[PDB]
Design a binder for this molecule. Structure first.
Ligand SMILES: Cc1cc2nc3c(=O)[nH]c(=O)nc-3n(C[C@H](O)[C@H](O)[C@H](O)COP(=O)(O)O)c2cc1C
Length: 116
């Protein structure tokens, strides 16, 4: 099965990526060594809806799962629609341990409907 996903450590400054799947590197055209320890916001760009980024920010604050569709950019500057699913991961004692984010590329919801 193909799966674009990255894993971040919220107990380190600014939620850095500590693991990225091979297909994520394939989709984003980045190498593994140039995104490790990065915040995933580097995928955003001029066309990224800031109102959608705000929804992600609130979901991380409240440590709840969320699904949004937003524009992301590859290393070479190509735009692609990203159906992004974020999920909190807790340990045996109920403490937040990781965030996992899954990316599906494609304009699943038509943008004229997404803008409403
Ligand atoms: C595990 C994880 C994966 C993420 N993946 C993406 C992503 O693929 N694309 C994206 O635009 N933002 C992604 N984000 C969100 C950004 O890292 C960041 O949280 C978002 O831009 C809001 O934070 P900010 O307002 O500080 O920039 C991800 C966040 C986490 C925790």
């Amino acid at each position: 099965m193909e799966k674009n996903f990255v894993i971040s450590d919220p107990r380190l400054p600014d939620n850095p990526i500590i693991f990225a799947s091979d297909s994520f590197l394939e989709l984003t055209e980045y190498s593994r060594e140039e995104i490790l320890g990065r915040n995933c916001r580097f995928l955003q760009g001029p066309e990224t809806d800031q109102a959608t980024v705000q929804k992600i920010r609130d979901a991380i604050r409240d440590q709840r799962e969320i699904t949004v569709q937003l524009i992301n950019y590859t290393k070479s500057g190509k735009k692609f629609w990203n159906l992004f699913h974020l999920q909190p991961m807790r340990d045996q004692k109920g403490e937040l341990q990781y965030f996992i984010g899954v990316q599906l590329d494609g304009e699943f919801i038509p943008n004229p409907l997404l803008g409403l």
